[PDB]
Ligand binder design. Structure first.
Ligand code: APC
Ligand code: APC
Ligand code: MN
Lengths: 149, 152
């Protein structure tokens, strides 16, 4: 819908911004698995969403950059939350934010996007499986589909 | 005298303003009284967020989109960031002063809002209300003024 696409653009434009600037980011989009347990380990925001706020949160050396940001519907549920970590061998040993995204994907049906601190690649995790280095067009397609759809 | 959650907030704000004072990070926070600032809210970015010391710090970090302009609070929620306020033209304002000070004042003039400013250059905490700017208040005085202007 017309309003849903503004949010996809807001999110998609923020991760592209952080991709080029090499800012690591970890954003969880809640489906039907309740993530209120993982929200409560972070800082509550209950915030509306905007490309500018998404970028501010993940600025390095800031309080909210540490941990995952959790989205519930149209609002920022929390920032700086910690997700559990998977120990599966398929994970390449070459980041923790990648560990956290797979972790939450094994324990929930959430859709998580990761931007790599070192490479700037856009990766996603859902259904316990990591999808690495996807293009922006592919990312918007998947985000639209898992987030609303 | 004040509710436990009400005191949660002050502290939150108070710890955020102190952190930014020592680091010389400029900040501008407007607390809405009864004059509606929705016109000034609409010039920023909407947030409608809850308050925490950590978010207040993130907003005003230099070189970020949300740092330039004012943060406007309505009750318990951050209404918007990067809002712009009118600039005072009073002759008494010192040429030495920053735009934001100029701004706070301005806002003071046309509304009954309570505005706090931390100067990038000195780290001094100043507050604004009723067209009057009171410079360099101490942290203890700031919590007193904020509590009474914010929650009456
Ligand atoms: N429980 C948890 N759940 C989710 N994310 C976490 C987490 N603990 C830490 N993080 C994220 O992990 C990031 C830091 O990871 P680090 O301790 O620097 C190992 P790293 O990610 O491999 O660094 P690198 O990516 O540069 O190699 C933090 O910035 C935080 O965002
Ligand atoms: N109308 C307004 N309302 C609120 N804040 C304002 C404002 N106009 C400017 N500011 C604040 O003023 C600060 C910049 O001070 P200025 O006097 O404008 C030097 P500047 O060139 O604008 O700094 P810049 O280097 O960020 O451009 C900005 O952080 C912004 O926060
Ligand atoms: Mn200037």
């Amino acid at each position: 819908s017309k309003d849903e696409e503004k949010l996809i653009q807001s999110v998609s434009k923020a991760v592209q911004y952080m991709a080029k600037r090499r800012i690591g980011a970890l954003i969880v989009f809640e489906k039907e698995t309740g993530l209120q347990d993982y929200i409560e380990t972070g800082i509550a925001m209950d915030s509306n969403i905007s490309q500018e706020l998404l970028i501010n949160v993940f600025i390095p050396n800031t309080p909210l950059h540490d941990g995952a940001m959790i989205i519930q519907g149209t609002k920022i549920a929390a920032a700086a939350s910690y997700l559990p970590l998977s120990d599966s061998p398929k994970i390449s040993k070459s980041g923790t934010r990648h560990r956290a995204a797979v972790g939450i994907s094994e324990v929930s049906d959430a859709f998580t996007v990761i931007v790599s601190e070192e490479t700037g690649d856009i990766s996603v995790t859902f259904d316990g499986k990591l999808r690495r280095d996807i293009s922006n067009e592919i990312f918007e397609e998947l985000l639209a589909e898992h987030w609303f759809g």
